[PDB]
């Protein structure tokens, strides 16, 4: 099926969804050095944004090859940030906790 | 750009080679702080370098 090559470290974005319930995968639960994967059943909406309005510059670095950088910021300076819903995230964490409690 | 809680950017000017390869001109650009490192261990708050 369609495989999404999304680059992420802590979370999984735009992945597949489980059929019935959250499913926990691990090579061996006894070994703490391994990495434990949790595949969710319901997605969690996440909205990231960069409010800054950057300007694209062009500098002739070498012959016939241009270099692009940030020239100036128009308006005020703000913080780029990501938003998720607290209630849905807490419910998802509780679901993951009850799923983990089977092994513990 | 002035003090604030934002990560902010640094306005750095440097000499770039123009279309003539034996001539230089002055240019400037805004760079992120993680991409900027002090050039040398000596105390100098005006001279910097890329992280590369």
């Amino acid at each position, epitope marked *: 099926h369609g495989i999404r090559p999304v680059v992420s470290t802590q979370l999984l974005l735009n992945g597949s969804l489980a059929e019935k319930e959250i499913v926990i995968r691990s090579e061996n639960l006894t070994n703490n050095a391994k990495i434990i994967i949790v595949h969710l059943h319901t997605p969690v909406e996440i909205v990231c944004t960069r*409010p800054n*309005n950057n300007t694209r510059k062009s500098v002739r670095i070498g012959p016939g090859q241009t270099f692009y950088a940030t020239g100036d910021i128009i308006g005020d300076i*703000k913080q780029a940030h990501c938003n998720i819903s607290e209630e849905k995230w807490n419910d998802t964490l509780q679901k993951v906790g009850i799923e983990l409690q089977k092994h513990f | 750009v002035k003090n604030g809680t934002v990560e902010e950017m640094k306005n750095c000017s440097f000499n770039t080679t123009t279309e003539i390869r034996d001539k230089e001109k002055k240019e400037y650009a805004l760079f992120y702080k993680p991409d900027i490192v002090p050039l040398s261990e000596t105390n100098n708050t005006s001279e910097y370098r890329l992280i590369n």
Partner: antibody
Amino acid sequence: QVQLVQSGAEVKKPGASVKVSCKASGYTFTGYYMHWVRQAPGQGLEWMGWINPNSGRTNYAQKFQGRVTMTRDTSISTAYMELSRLRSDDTAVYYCARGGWISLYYDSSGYPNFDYWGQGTLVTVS
Amino acid sequence: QSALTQPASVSGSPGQSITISCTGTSSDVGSYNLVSWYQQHPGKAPKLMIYEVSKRPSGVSNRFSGSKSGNTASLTISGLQAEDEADYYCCSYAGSSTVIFGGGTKLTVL
């Protein structure tokens, strides 16, 4: 409540510089932007610029960059407007207004929402 | 440099519905929903009447309204009185953190 107070009257010869003080009371000075506009007699409202009290970030409209400057004093909570190179047509009332809310997540500087206005400073170059 | 295009004179009568429309370029009113209407009597400071095209601030009655279509915005006033004879200004956000005001209008009551 929210109160903005400026100078009453101002007389200045052409070619000099003028300082206008906008003192705000009744609310946190660093919570909202501060806008400066100008109104000539007969003519409507001309928008000059805005200033963020927290940082030193200021923005001015066209035909005013370099000619005017905006600063602030947080200890006394007073905005300063320094205008140089006064001409014969600069005889006008300068008004100080309160902009949007500073949130640090979206740009609220450009919203034209001015709840409160000062009495205005009348600069005369007659 | 040109400001927003606004009528210079609007006349009406008491107990009538009158609309004053201000229009601008494709960058000021074409894709931004920040249009405000202020009123100003001579000799005193202005005050807000309508903000965000159709919303109403606290302290203003239900006499005023608003609209937003294409590249123009209209202030509709129903039930005019003799107190409404003053200046009306239509302000908008022109992009790049710039605020632009209208040309100016003077409401007349016959």
